[PDB]
């Protein structure tokens with residue numbers, strides 16, 4: 001959950017209250033290399049759900 | 053008008069218009085207006101004596117089955133003599149649709165409570181009492197739900213100020229949190245943001 | 261674009277706390293599935309409506 | 313075939329759904345005969361109840377009856393027939409086919425103000 | 426990553442899962458904190474011709490709600506939409 | 522243009538299903554091990 | 565001028581409800597002074613109840629006094645059941661508030677309020 | 679370019695200083711009045727007037743999209759320089 | 774055996790802070806004794822690894 | 823398009839019944855849970871050594887506010903009041919007048935950091951990059967009024983943090 005707050009902070013600058021998704025779309029585009037780290041999170045998160 | 057304009061759903065517009073005709077002719081004792089918005093939402097505007105027949109019909113009819121009360125809402129519009137607009141958002145899971153049921157009251161006329169139709173409404177219309185002062189007759193436990201226990205007035209009325217009338221602080225003399233009249237160190241700065249030019253010619257009200 | 265991603269919807273059977281626990285865990289599984297589909301199907305383009 | 317569960321919690325499996333639906337539909341029509349003929353609720357509910365009763369009588373199977381009654385499981389079709397019966401018994405008391413009880417005030421549904 | 430093979434094998438045995446293929450601590454596989462500058466695309470209204478705003482005006486095509494009935498035959502009974510199609514069970518993993 | 526995009530072949534496969542890998546002995550075997558430990562202790 | 569009532573058809577039933585609500589508050593005041601362990605006396609709290617009832621003594625509309633009885637029953641229900649704390653009960657007694665200037669001249673001295 | 683009142687209190691770039699008999703100097707007693715000593719009116723005065731050969735020049739404050747909006751400054755007055763309304767950099771037509 | 778490599782890494786952490794004095798200095802100031810590559814040092818004395 | 827969590831009827835042959843009875847009497851899933859907790863005993867913990875190690879941040883981070891300058895020392899704020907027009911908390915208070923060389927500058931620029939919701943609408947509304955929201959988050963005070971920033975505090979934060987603020991804007995201005 002800390003790593004997903006890092007995803008929010010990389011996309012908006014806030015870890016929780018991003019004000020990012022806005023009427024009309026989103027505020028700002030994805031920074032480069034964000035989707036690779038979302039991939040690296042999602043590739044391992046199944047094992048986390050498994051051990052929970 | 054392709055990429056940036058919301059595409060119009062003509063099928064759902066026609067279907068909700070036909071169902072609005074259906075509800076208007078099954079219940080003409082209470083139905084006043086039926087209107088479908090441009091983004092395909094169906095509003096039934098009723099007389100407040102038919103809160104229980106219209107909602108029980110929409111809950112139990114085989115071509116309605118609006119088993120889910122999504123939301124129940126008052127809206128305060130002070131220029132109308134029946135200033136409170138009680139809005140029922142219903143959800144049909146059988147037919148995958150939503151309907152809006154709207155009715156009116158002023159400060160003194162009670163609306164009949166709809167907990168016999170939807171038990172979801174128990175806290176919603178209690179919140180409408182707490183925030184607007186709309187009394188719901190024959191309610192199981194009608195009281196405040198969101199404001200403080202000694203609270204005077206109904207905060208979501210539009211003649212009620214943003215900061216209220218009282219504010220709290222701890223007072224060391226009486227060893228007690230006390231209520232004193234509200235004073236702001238910085239006043240809420242009101243911004244007159246409205247443009248003097250008409251934005252939407254399709255919504256122009258006709259002159260007197 | 262939820263009509264373009266592909267996920268299953270977990271359904272309980274007994275209405276209890278335990279089936280709602282299992283529904284939330286399986287919704288985390290299916291969120292991982294949707295995130296994999298979103299990372300693979302991200303389109304190019306602008307991120308706001310181009311109505312200024 | 314004895315459906316083991318409906319999947320819905322608290323919805324018991326009905327052993328004989330056909331006879332139960334026939335009793336419910338004819339009882340809806342019996343109650344609905346006490347409404348005037350010019351009432352649109354009577355005409356519409358007789359219409360859909362006769363359609364559902366014809367579908368129930370014309371299909372001995374339960375699964376195909378579910379696929380063509382088009383209303384989910386057969387036990388919740390039974391429940392909706394019960395709800396329609398209870399509604400018709402309430403609609404006799406309300407008499408909502410009568411004319412409009414009161415016109416609204418002149419700018420009551422005028423938005424924006 | 427710096428765990429010795431004995432602790433790594435003990436940890437994999439007690440978990441029952443291979444834990445080194447999916448480590449929850451991040452290392453050199455993550456993106457570099459210094460990135461090249463982007464060149465972001467523009468929208469479809471960034472055109473020099475055939476681009477009149479009245480031909481793409483979203484807010485002005487909104488209309489007031491069409492009043493169906495107001496208080497100022499053997500027509501078919503209708504529903505608000507067609508009935509919802511019955512969901513199919515999962516082919517991926519039904520838990521059956 | 523340079524935008525945050527997936528690579529050419531797409532990303533790799535991401536697991537999302539339960540893996541509770543069914544370890545341990547059988548029910549016959551575990552009672553046999555317990556009864557064997559009892560009999561060794563008794564002897 | 566044909567309005568739907570709340571509880572009372574006219575003012576006599578309305579005064580009956582006002583009277584029963586006053587009886588209920590008068591019975592409750594010793595319990596409120598005891599279990600909230602207020603620093604007031606029972607006579608002082610009863611004078612406050614009489615003050616709150618005489619504050620609304622000008623109302624001639626049955627629906628308005630029906631709502632006044634309803635809100636008084638809600639206050640009573642929040643006071644009998646311990647939902648209010650001691651602070652909510654003592655907010656009727658404006659103790660930390662300074663005494664406001666009453667006549668013209670002292671209001672002239674302190675400020676601009678009429 | 680901070681100057682000092684006779685009470686010893688520093689004066690901000692606005693010109694704000696508390697009086698000798700104003701009680702609100704007690705908030706700085708035992709503490710400090712925080713001013714910024716880089717006055718912008720003194721720092722922009724140190725920038726030299728840019729000699730350009732055109733009748734109209736443009737300024738965006740340097741940096742492209744990192745500056746201010748691009749405005750066009752007329753330079754027909756030979757008595758007075760043309761000053762940017764955003765950044766305060768001033769320009770002179772060399773002829 | 775790979776335990777000997779762990780103990781030699783611990784002893785070279787003791788050595789990489791300049792002996793036991795620097796080792797206890799970083800053990801009590803930082804609560805962390807591991808050694809790193811000195812990236813730089815600012816004008817105050819903060820050292821970055 | 824749906825799956826049934828917990829709709830498994832267990833096998834009633836003697837093998838599976840003895841399996842479930844061995845699970846009951848010999849606590850097999852409890853030893854499984856002990857093994858998973860023991861597996862985390864021998865992992866390297868995720869604990870960073872704050873304050874000597876810092877949590878990772880991006881150049882978009884929204885921390886303490888600062889008023890910026892041009893590369894001449896001239897302050898960028900030209901008193902246009904867009905930032906207090908958009909400020910959803912009304913934390914910003916601005917007064918203004920022409921200063922002694924005729925320039926449109928502020929005399930007041932207050933930001934109540936205890937009203938502020940740190941959403942960065944002021945830095946995206948500002949047409950001249952004057953108000954920005956810097957990387958400083960380590961600015962807890964001991965008194966409430968030390969978080970009621972006037973213009974001098976914000977200009978000192980700008981002068982203090984410009985070497986970092988300008989590099990973060992340099993990294994992120996093409997997304998803006």
Ligand code: SF4
Pocket residue numbers: 905908909910911912913914933937938939940941942943944945955
């Ligand atoms: S970050 Fe948001 S709340 Fe804070 S000063 Fe800026 S606009 Fe106002």
Ligand code: SF4
Pocket residue numbers: 898899900901902903904905906916944947948949950951952953
């Ligand atoms: S938006 Fe920028 S230039 Fe305008 S008043 Fe605010 S800080 Fe100053």
Ligand SMILES: [Zn+2]
Pocket residue numbers: 737738739746762763764765766767
């Ligand atoms: Zn300029």
